[PDB]
Every structure is written in C-alpha cells, then in structure tokens.
Amino acid sequence: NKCDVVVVGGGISGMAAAKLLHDSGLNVVVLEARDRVGGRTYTLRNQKVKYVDLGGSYVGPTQNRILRLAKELGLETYKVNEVERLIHHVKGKSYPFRGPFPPVWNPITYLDHNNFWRTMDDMGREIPSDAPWKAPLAEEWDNMTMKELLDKLCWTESAKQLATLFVNLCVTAETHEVSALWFLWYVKQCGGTTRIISTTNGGQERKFVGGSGQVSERIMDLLGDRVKLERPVIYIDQTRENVLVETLNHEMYEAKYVISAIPPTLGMKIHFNPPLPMMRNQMITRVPLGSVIKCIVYYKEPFWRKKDYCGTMIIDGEEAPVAYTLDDTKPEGNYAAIMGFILAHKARKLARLTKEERLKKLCELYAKVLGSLEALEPVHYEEKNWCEEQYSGGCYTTYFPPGILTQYGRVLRQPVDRIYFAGTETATHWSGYMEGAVEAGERAAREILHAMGKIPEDEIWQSEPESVDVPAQPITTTFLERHLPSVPGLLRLIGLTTI
Amino acid sequence: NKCDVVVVGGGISGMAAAKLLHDSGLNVVVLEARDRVGGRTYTLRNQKVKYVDLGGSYVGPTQNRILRLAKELGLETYKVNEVERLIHHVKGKSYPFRGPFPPVWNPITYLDHNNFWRTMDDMGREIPSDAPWKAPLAEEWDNMTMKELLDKLCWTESAKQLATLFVNLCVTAETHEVSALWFLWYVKQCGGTTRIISTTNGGQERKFVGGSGQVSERIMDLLGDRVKLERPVIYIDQTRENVLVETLNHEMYEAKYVISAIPPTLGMKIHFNPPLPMMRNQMITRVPLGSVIKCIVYYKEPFWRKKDYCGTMIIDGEEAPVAYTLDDTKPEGNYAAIMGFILAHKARKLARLTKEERLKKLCELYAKVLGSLEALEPVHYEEKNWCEEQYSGGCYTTYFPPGILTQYGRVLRQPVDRIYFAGTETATHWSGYMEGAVEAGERAAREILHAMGKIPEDEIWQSEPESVDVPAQPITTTFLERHLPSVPGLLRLI
Ligand SMILES: *Cc1cc2c(cc1C)nc1c(=O)[nH]c(=O)nc-1n2C[C@H](O)[C@H](O)[C@H](O)COP(=O)(O)OP(=O)(O)OC[C@H]1O[C@@H](n2cnc3c(N)ncnc32)[C@H](O)[C@@H]1O
Ligand SMILES: *Cc1cc2c(cc1C)nc1c(=O)[nH]c(=O)nc-1n2C[C@H](O)[C@H](O)[C@H](O)COP(=O)(O)OP(=O)(O)OC[C@H]1O[C@@H](n2cnc3c(N)ncnc32)[C@H](O)[C@@H]1O
Numbered sequence: 001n002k003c004d005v006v007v008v009g010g011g012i013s014g015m016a017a018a019k020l021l022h023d024s025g026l027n028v029v030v031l032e033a034r035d036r037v038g039g040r041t042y043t044l045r046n047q048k049v050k051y052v053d054l055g056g057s058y059v060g061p062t063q064n065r066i067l068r069l070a071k072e073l074g075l076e077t078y079k080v081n082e083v084e085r086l087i088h089h090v091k092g093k094s095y096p097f098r099g100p101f102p103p104v105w106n107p108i109t110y111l112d113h114n115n116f117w118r119t120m121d122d123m124g125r126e127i128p129s130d131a132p133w134k135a136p137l138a139e140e141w142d143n144m145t146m147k148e149l150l151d152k153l154c155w156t157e158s159a160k161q162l163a164t165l166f167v168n169l170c171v172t173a174e175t176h177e178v179s180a181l182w183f184l185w186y187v188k189q190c191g192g193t194t195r196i197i198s199t200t201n202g203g204q205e206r207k208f209v210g211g212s213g214q215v216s217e218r219i220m221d222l223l224g225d226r227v228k229l230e231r232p233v234i235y236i237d238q239t240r241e242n243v244l245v246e247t248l249n250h251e252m253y254e255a256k257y258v259i260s261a262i263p264p265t266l267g268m269k270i271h272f273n274p275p276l277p278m279m280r281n282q283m284i285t286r287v288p289l290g291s292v293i294k295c296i297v298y299y300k301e302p303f304w305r306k307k308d309y310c311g312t313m314i315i316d317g318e319e320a321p322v323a324y325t326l327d328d329t330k331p332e333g334n335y336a337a338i339m340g341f342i343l344a345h346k347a348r349k350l351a352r353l354t355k356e357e358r359l360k361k362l363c364e365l366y367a368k369v370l371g372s373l374e375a376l377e378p379v380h381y382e383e384k385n386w387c388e389e390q391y392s393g394g395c396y397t398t399y400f401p402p403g404i405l406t407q408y409g410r411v412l413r414q415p416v417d418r419i420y421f422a423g424t425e426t427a428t429h430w431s432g433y434m435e436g437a438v439e440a441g442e443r444a445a446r447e448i449l450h451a452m453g454k455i456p457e458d459e460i461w462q463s464e465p466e467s468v469d470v471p472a473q474p475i476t477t478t479f480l481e482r483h484l485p486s487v488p489g490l491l492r493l494i495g496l497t498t499i
Numbered sequence: 500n501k502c503d504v505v506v507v508g509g510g511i512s513g514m515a516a517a518k519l520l521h522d523s524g525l526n527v528v529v530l531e532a533r534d535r536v537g538g539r540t541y542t543l544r545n546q547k548v549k550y551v552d553l554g555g556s557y558v559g560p561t562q563n564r565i566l567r568l569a570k571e572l573g574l575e576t577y578k579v580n581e582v583e584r585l586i587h588h589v590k591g592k593s594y595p596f597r598g599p600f601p602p603v604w605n606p607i608t609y610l611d612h613n614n615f616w617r618t619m620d621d622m623g624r625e626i627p628s629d630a631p632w633k634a635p636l637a638e639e640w641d642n643m644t645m646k647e648l649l650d651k652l653c654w655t656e657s658a659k660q661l662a663t664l665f666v667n668l669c670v671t672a673e674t675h676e677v678s679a680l681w682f683l684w685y686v687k688q689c690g691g692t693t694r695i696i697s698t699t700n701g702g703q704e705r706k707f708v709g710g711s712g713q714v715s716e717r718i719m720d721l722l723g724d725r726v727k728l729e730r731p732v733i734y735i736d737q738t739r740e741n742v743l744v745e746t747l748n749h750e751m752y753e754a755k756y757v758i759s760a761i762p763p764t765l766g767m768k769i770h771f772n773p774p775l776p777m778m779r780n781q782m783i784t785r786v787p788l789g790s791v792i793k794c795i796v797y798y799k800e801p802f803w804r805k806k807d808y809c810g811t812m813i814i815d816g817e818e819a820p821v822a823y824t825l826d827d828t829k830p831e832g833n834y835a836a837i838m839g840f841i842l843a844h845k846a847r848k849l850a851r852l853t854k855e856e857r858l859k860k861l862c863e864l865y866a867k868v869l870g871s872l873e874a875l876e877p878v879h880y881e882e883k884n885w886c887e888e889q890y891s892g893g894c895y896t897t898y899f900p901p902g903i904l905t906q907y908g909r910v911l912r913q914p915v916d917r918i919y920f921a922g923t924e925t926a927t928h929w930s931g932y933m934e935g936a937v938e939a940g941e942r943a944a945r946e947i948l949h950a951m952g953k954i955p956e957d958e959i960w961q962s963e964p965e966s967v968d969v970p971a972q973p974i975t976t977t978f979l980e981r982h983l984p985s986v987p988g989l990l991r992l993i
C-alpha cells in the first residue's frame with residue numbers, strides 16, 4: 001500500500017532506479033506487469049543452451065554505468081568472438097575481411113563510402129546529446145527520413161545499400177520510417193558510427209556470463225518483496241496529497257512520487273487523473289518501437305572458426321531473412337551458436353512462418369554465406385519475436401518518425417507533477433541500450449531525491465568513472481579519411497580544372 | 500453485467516453500431532469513458548452562442564449515411580454561407596474570388612497548379628478505397644512523405660504553398676509527417692480533391708441545426724440506461740466462453756462479442772488477454788491523430804457580407820495562426836461568427852498562449868484579411884484544443900506516417916477473435932468524418948450479425964441510397980484542365 005516511491009516497470013531502468021532509492025533509505029515498490037523482471041532483457045535457461053539472451057545482450061567500452069552496476073551485482077563479462085575473419089555477403093557472394101568495416105576497392109565507391117560515414121558523424125557533432133531539437137538545422141533534418149538523406153548523400157548504390165543495412169540494424173526500422181535528425185542523434189549519442197557498429201572496441205564487444213537478465217534478477221533479490229510481479233499499472237491519480245497507483249489485479253499503492261520506467265508509448269496503457277498535459281498526451285501516440293526477431297541457431301561445434309570465419313556476417317539483400325549475425329558460442333567454447341537478427345519489415349514478413357520454417361531459412365542462408373554444408377545440421381534453435389510483446393511494444397527501442405523529435409522531444413523526460421521518467425529512451429548516452437536504462441533510472445531517482453531536498457540540483461546528473469575491466473580505445477581517423485573528397489566534391493574539382 | 504454485445508466508445512460510430520444491434524433485437528451496452536457521448540463531436544450550449552460545434556460539424560453531398568441517420572433522429576441541416584466571395588490571402592494581401600479554387604494568373608504557375616490537383620486525383624484512381632496497400636505502387640508511394648511528393652511535383656513555390664495548406668487542412672498534420680500513399684488514399688476515399696475541399700457541392704456544404712452532438716445524444720436517448728458514462732474500458736478478456744470487459748470504475752461486463760469504436764491508437768489504453776496478435780500490437784503504436792484547435796470568434800453582425808465576402812478565408816504563411824476559416828453564423832443570420840482552425844504545428848506552438856491571447860491574434864489576423872476594423876471587436880469567443888483530449892488523442896483523425904499503411908494497414912479492421920472494429924478510421928468512404936463513423940459502426944455491427952448467423956455474408960457491407968435533401972452534383976473537368984501540360988511537360992515540348 002504505502003511507500004515513498006512507486007517505480008512502474010521492473011526492467012533494468014526501473015530496477016536501477018529502485019536500487020538507488022532503496023540504498024538511499026527510501027521505501028520503494030516496483031510494480032511489474034509481467035511474471036518476471038528484466039523487460040527487454042530476457043535470459044532463457046534450459047539444458048540445451050545452458051543460458052541464452054533472447055533480448056538485450058551486448059555491452060562494450062564507454063558503457064560504464066551498466067558495467068559498474070553489473071560488477072557490483074557480482075557479474076562478469078566475456079568477449080564476443082572476433083578472432084577470425086568477418087564476412088560481407090553482397091550480390092550472392094561472400095567477401096571475408098578484418099576490421100569494423102568491409103573494404104571498398106573501387107576508387108569512386110570508396111570515396112562515397114568514406115564520405116557517408118564521415119558525414120554521419122559530421123552531422124552528429126551539431127546535435128546536442130541532451131537536446132537534439134537544439135541542433136542548428138534540427139527542423140530541416142527532422143522533416144526528412146533517413147531514406148531521403150541516404151538518397152541525397154550516397155552517389156553509389158553500394159554505399160546506399162550498406163547504409164540501409166546500418167540503419168536497419170541500429171534501430172530495427174526502415175530508412176523511410178525514421179527521422180534523419182533522430183537517427184543522427186541516436187548514432188552520435190552512442191559515440192558515433194565506429195563505436196556503435198564495432199564489436200572489438202564497440203557496443204558489441206562483450207556479453208555477461210550467465211546472461212543480462214541477471215542484472216534485473218539480482219536487483220530483485222536485493223529488494224525482496226518490494227518487487228510486485230504481475231501488477232500491470234492501469235491508473236495514476238495525482239489529484240490528492242499522495243499519488244495513487246492502481247494495478248490491473250485491483251491493488252492500490254500510495255506514494256510521494258512515481259517513476260515511470262516503461263517505454264514511452266506504453267504510457268498509453270495507463271489512465272491518468274488529471275489528464276496528461278497536451279504535449280505528452282500526443283507524444284505517447286507518436287513514438288513506436290522497432291521490429292525484430294532474435295534467432296539463435298545451435299551447432300555441434302563452432303565450425304566457422306575452422307574456415308577462419310569468426311561468425312560475424314553482414315548480409316545484404318532482400319532474400320536474406322537475417323542481415324547480421326554474431327558468434328554466440330559460450331566463452332568455454334561449447335554450445336556453439338550463431339545469433340542473427342531478422343530486422344524491421346522482415347520481422348513482420350517472416351513472423352507468419354513456423355519456428356521450424358524460420359530455422360530452415362536461416363540454416364540455408366548461413367550455409368550459403370559460410371560456404372559450409374555443416375550449417376544445415378543445427379542441433380537446437382531458440383528465437384524471440386519482440387513484436388508480439390504487449391509490455392514491450394517491440395525492440396530494441398523507440399524510434400521517432402519525421403517531425404516528431406522537434407515537436408515533442410522536449411517533453412520525453414519532463415516531469416508531470418510527481419511523475420518522473422526513467423527508461424532507456426530518456427537517456428542521453430547509449431539511449432536504446434542497457435547502459436541508457438541505467439543512466440535514466442538513476443537520473444530519475446536523483447530527480448526525486450532532489451525534489452525531497454536530499455541532494456543538491458548539481459547531483460541529479462552524475463558522471464561515471466571509466467570501467468577498469470573494459471577500457472575504451474579512442475576512435476581515430478586517418479588523414480585520407482578526413483580529407484578525401486566526396487563524389488560531388490571530386491566532380492567539382494574536375495569541373496574547375498576543366499574550366 | 501450480461502449482454503449480447505458491448506460497444507466500447509459512445510462516439511457516432513459506437514452509437515450507430517449500438518443502434519443497429521438494438522434495432523435488430525440484441526441486448527447492447529455502450530461503455531463510454533467520458534461524462535458525455537459524442538467523442539470527437541461536441542456541441543456546447545450557452546446563452547452567448549446558443550449552440551456551437553467545437554468538434555466535427557460539416558456534412559455534405561455523398562455523405563449519405565450520416566445524413567440518413569441524422570434525419571431519422573429528427574435533425575435537419577442548413578447551408579454554410581458561401582453566397583459572397585471567398586478570400587485567398589497570400590504574401591500579406593487579400594485576393595477575393597468565386598468557385599472552390601483560388602485563381603492563378605501567371606501562366607507557368609497556372610500549369611503547375613492545374614497539374615498538381617490533377618495528379619493527386621490521377622494517383623488516387625490507382626488506390627483501392629477498401630485496400631490502399633493494393634495500389635500498384637503502394638510501397639513506392641507509402642515510403643515517401645507528402646513533403647517529398649510535393650517537392651517532386653510542384654515546380655512553383657505558389658503551388659507548393661497551397662498544396663501544403665491543403666494537406667494541413669485536410670488531415671491536421673504536416674506534409675513531412677504523413678505517407679503519400681495514405682494521404683492520396685484519404686483524398687480519393689472522400690471523392691477526390693474537388694469534393695473534399697468544396698463548401699458548395701462538397702464536404703463543407705452543411706451543418707446540423709442545433710449541432711452534430713445531437714446525433715450521439717439522441718441515440719443515447721433511444722438506448723436509455725444501456726449507455727454507461729464514465730466507464731473507461733481498461734481490460735478485455737477473451738480466454739473464456741463469454742468475453743469479459745472491465746472498466747476503470749471496477750465494473751464487469753459480459754458479452755458474446757465486442758465492438759471497439761475508439762480511435763485505433765486508443766486501443767493501447769486497454770490491457771488484452773490473451774495479448775493482441777503481433778501486427779495489431781505494433782499497429783496501435785504507429786497511428787497518431789492530428790493536431791488542431793477549433794476557434795470560433797463571435798461578432799455583433801456578419802459584417803464581412805457587407806463587403807461581399809462570405810467569410811471563407813484561405814490564409815497562407817507561417818505568421819497566420821489560422822490558415823482556413825468559414826462563416827459560422829446561424830441560419831437565422833444571428834450569432835454572427837467566424838470559425839477558424841489552428842492547424843498541425845501551429846496548434847502545438849500556440850497552445851502555450853492564453854485563450855485571450857489567441858483571441859487577440861485571431862481578431863488581428865481577420866481584420867487584416869477582411870480589411871475590416873470590425874474584426875477587432877469580438878463579442879464572444881469559444882475554442883477547443885483537441886490535442887489535450889486523453890480519450891480522443893487529437894483531431895480530426897488518425898494519420899499514417901511513411902511505411903505504416905502498407906505494413907500494418909490490412910489489420911485495421913481485422914477482427915480479433917470476438918472483437919470487431921468500428922470507428923471512422925476503419926471506413927472506406929469518408930474515413931475521418933462523421934460519415935465514416937456511421938459506415939464503420941454499421942458495418943462492424945453487421946459483421947457480428949453475420950457471425951451470429953442472422954444475416955448472410957453479402958449483407959455485411961451495405962450501399963446507401965442518395966439523400967433527397969442533399970443531392971450530389973457530379974465533379975466535372977474542362978478539356979483544358981484534362982490536357983494542359985505540366986511544367987516539365989511543357990519543357991519537353993520546348
Ligand atoms: C528486445 C531487444 C533489446 C535489445 C537488444 C536485442 C533485443 C532483441 N540488444 C541489446 C544489446 O545487445 N545491448 C543493449 O544494451 N541493449 C539491447 N537491446 C535493448 C535493451 O534490451 C533495452 O534498451 C533495455 O533492456 C531497456 O530497459 P528499460 O528498463 O528502459 O525498459 P524495459 O526493459 O522495457 O522495462 C520496462 C518494464 O516495464 C514493464 N511494464 C510495461 N508496462 C507496464 C505497466 N503498465 N505496468 C507495470 N509494468 C509495465 C515491462 O514488463 C518491463 O519489464
Ligand atoms: C475534433 C474534430 C473532428 C472533426 C472536425 C473538427 C474537429 C475539431 N470536423 C469535422 C467535420 O466538419 N465533419 C466531419 O464529418 N468530421 C469532422 N471531424 C471528425 C469527426 O468528428 C470524427 O470523424 C467522428 O466524430 C469520429 O467518430 P468515432 O465514433 O469514430 O470516434 P470518436 O468520436 O472519437 O468516439 C470514440 C469514443 O470512445 C470513447 N473512448 C475512448 N477510449 C475509451 C475507452 N478506453 N473506454 C471507453 N470509451 C472510450 C471516447 O470518449 C469517445 O466518446
């Protein structure tokens with residue numbers, strides 16, 4: 001019934017918020033809709049897989065908050081396999097390579113690729129992480145889709161195709177679905193193109209031994225009966241001295257403050273008294289989550305390694321159900337597996353099939369890409385279609401269609417009376433990720449601590465010491481990468497020398 | 500507690516569905532979230548205005564279902580004043596005109612304008628009303644915004660500006676916010692550019708004497724205590740023999756079937772057991788409603804008529820809070836008023852101001868456009884910002900951002916077990932309008948009648964006889980309008 005703070009949602013963000021408040025001496029309750037904590041993280045355990053992350057999994061350098069929280073909870077990481085060669089599969093053929101980026105040999109195509117990534121980061125530098133709507137060209141950039149921007153920037157089909165895959169992979173949405181401003185913000189707030197796309201020295205460097213679900217689970221262990229499972233929140237009433245929070249199973253909770261730690265649009269599942277202010281009322285109808293099926297195919301051995309392939313495949317083309325894979329073999333070298341994502345429209349297209357039908361399509365694809373008949377002999381399969389989840393709405397995160405971030409963005413984490421807003425979507429660094437979940441949950445918690453007069457204003461936002469275990473190498477560029485002209489840039493130089 | 504059909508939502512669509520089912524002999528209950536019926540229609544009554552529609556108001560030729568339903572309920576229409584000249588205000592200057600379209604005098608600009616409207620209708624002819632995702636170029640058109648399409652088609656800034664206003668007015672959203680496929684469908688399913696934009700012989704021809712709210716009110720009168728006000732639905736359970744519907748005020752309703760007659764996205768406010776299928780689960784997060792403040796400024800007399808202006812103003816430019824007005828004077832000639840819409844981003848921008856501040860801005864604008872100091876002397880003001888409504892989400896209707904209609908459109912009115920879907924968004928003719936609300940409510944009702952084996956399949960969708968009171972004149976084009984080249988077309992010939 002009565003407490004200091006009700007946290008709506010027991011994902012990483014809600015759990016991090018609850019833990020901070022609990023550690024500060026406040027009485028907290030976490031109201032979680034599902035029969036489990038973890039939300040967009042979910043670690044399945046069975047005999048065949050031991051454990052497998054079916055939701056959020058990867059962590060890496062510069063994600064210091066999630067690393068610190070997990071370490072405190074007694075968790076360890078291991079490195080995703082990137083020892084052997086990566087594969088870029090394009091136009092039905094595989095091209096092995098090393099480094100974060102597939103090599104480009106054609107001089108013109110090379111200039112185009114180089115310019116595209118450079119320009120993405122150039123534009124990102126103009127976008128404040130904590131206020132993307134303050135970018136000098138915010139309106140101009142927000143009013144076009146990523147598709148339009150790619151059409152403008154990419155003078156080769158090769159660059160456009162790879163850029164498209166990049167967008168699909170980063171935000172589980174189509175290039176025509178998302179605002180260019182929002183996407184450029186999203187990449188910049190993850191530290192840029194190299195950081196977001198890299199395994200070694202990037203977002204995909206590591207996984208947690210035993211699964212990421214342990215973060216939420218171990219916080220639940222700490223909080224005991226303060227976490228209430230199968231309590232979907234239906235109603236929040238702020239008309240009286242204490243906030244009243246009602247659940248679907250007819251329980252009433254009374255609190256001084258509330259943290260909403262659910263995906264922004266899932267705020268729609270709550271009836272508000274008094275009604276939300278106009279901007280938030282409409283905002284929460286304008287912010288969908290992406291579409292993805294995460295699929296893990298198990299094999300007797302990590303046979304790709306014997307062919308000097310690490311298991312990473314970047315697979316272009318409409319026919320391919322999966323556009324991106326990583327080796328998901330255990331650190332011990334057993335439970336050999338390939339993780340792949342079925343992205344955006346393909347998640348919707350292929351959801352119609354049976355589990356067995358999807359497994360067959362994936363194996364046949366992997367056999368082709370890896371040039372290996374062994375890929376046709378899986379020993380086990382697990383998958384999760386996040387599009388079907390009532391209490392997630394999708395994965396990985398919320399995307400902003402054209403025009404929305406500038407018009408409604410400022411309200412995303414603006415308190416509504418005594419309701420404060422956590423959730424990865426409200427983070428300013430690695431929003432969309434487990435890292436962003438921690439940042440947002442702890443920030444929301446400290447907003448309440450400040451409201452209670454327990455901490456000064458300048459302690460609401462808190463820096464994080466760099467992990468000693470996962471140090472971050474800086475992102476570097478070469479002289480040629482910095483100064484080589486774009487395709488139209490080269491054409492100008494040809495135009496002027498001819499004149 | 501127990502009934503045949505629970506209808507969620509007591510707007511026109513829910514009420515029309517409930518009435519049909521009731522008239523067929525079924526026991527119906529309407530669960531309405533608000534303390535009133537009508538939803539996106541709302542007629543305010545007070546001494547100063549007598550009555551005023553603050554939500555949906557206009558009806559016109561080809562909207563035969565709403566006209567028939569209203570007539571049966573004892574309502575009458577009157578004609579919106581369009582006797583005198585319309586005004587197009589552009590680059591700070593007023594240009595009076597007659598007919599539905601503001602004239603263009605520059606020859607190149609004429610070709611560009613002519614081509615734009617023609618092309619909109621040309622494209623629409625390839626879009627099936629009942630299945631826009633089956634258009635031959637559905638994906639190509641769905642993957643671009645209306646902004647991109649206008650940028651492609653309009654060789655003049657004049658055409659682009661007017662086209663932008665047209666989009667803003669029709670769907671209370673920015674050109675860059677909406678799918679081209681969806682917008683082209685929207686116009687086509689209202690009978691095309693001329694029909695949707697016209698007062699005389701179009702969607703804005705008429706209003707209901709006494710207000711459109713009377714439609715929902717009078718059906719509530721018929722249904723008696725079957726309508727439950729302040730019963731927001733929170734939970735629908737289909738795991739057992741009978742469907743269980745729970746409200747926020749802790750009441751339980753048991754039914755054989757349910758009609759969801761709420762805006763698609765407002766389905767999010769209901770927790771479902773079992774969960775919705777994947778496609779609907781995501782669809783209802785991808786379909787926002789537009790943004791609008793409807794504002795009515797009252798005056799001692801309809802003074803604009805004395806200057807041979809009817810009260811219609813089409814006002815271009817960022818500075819103008821209101822881009823479109825109509826005379827809102829009563830048929831009797833009293834309660835003189837100008838109705839104006841604050842559209843899309845301007846609704847969001849100007850919501851910050853006070854009611855009095857908005858009144859001042861509107862009066863000063865109207866004084867400029869009408870060239871009359873009398874506009875500065877209002878006697879009364881009413882307004883409604885639909886963006887603030889928890890149980891509407893916006894107005895007039897739901898828009899589809901790029902990529903959504905093709906990927907999710909087919910699921911909009913697909914039944915989910917024993918839940919059938921009404922609401923204007925699911926109509927195939929005048930979706931977005933009161934007309935569409937009636938079409939969808941009655942169709943959803945008849946889907947259930949068919950499910951019960953009471954009517955054959957071919958009776959689910961039913962034609963509507965043309966109103967004798969509001970006959971439709973056909974939409975015509977001239978030889979030159981049909982065959983004059985576009986700007987690039989002329990450049991080819993050169
Ligand atoms: C789905 C997914 C996510 C993901 C990814 C791959 C997939 C398939 N890969 C990631 C990765 O490799 N590395 C990474 O850092 N992130 C990755 N992501 C995203 C990541 O999982 C999320 O960013 C993160 O988990 C989000 O955490 P957050 O706490 O902000 O949000 P949540 O997990 O969705 O938690 C919300 C909880 O609230 C409950 N809920 C929802 N509605 C209610 C109501 N009405 N009442 C009470 N509780 C509610 C949900 O059940 C959930 O537990
Ligand atoms: C807002 C608006 C609309 C409008 C317009 C101008 C404005 C400012 N001008 C119009 C016009 O001139 N001519 C015309 O034909 N239409 C015009 N529109 C649109 C028109 O008002 C709508 O198309 C029509 O009213 C829609 O009717 P429909 O029945 O489909 O939808 P609704 O009115 O929104 O009714 C829904 C009801 O459901 C209730 N609700 C919502 N959630 C719940 C829950 N969870 N439980 C129970 N009830 C719920 C709403 O309260 C509402 O009453």
Ligand SMILES: CN[C@@H]1CCc2ccccc21
Pocket residue numbers: 058169170196197203204396432433
């Ligand atoms: C949340 N991060 C997603 C999850 C996997 C991945 C891979 C490359 C870039 C981004 C991502």
Ligand SMILES: CN[C@@H]1CCc2ccccc21
Pocket residue numbers: 557668669695696702703895931932
């Ligand atoms: C719902 N119809 C809207 C409401 C008023 C109007 C005017 C022109 C075109 C469309 C519209």
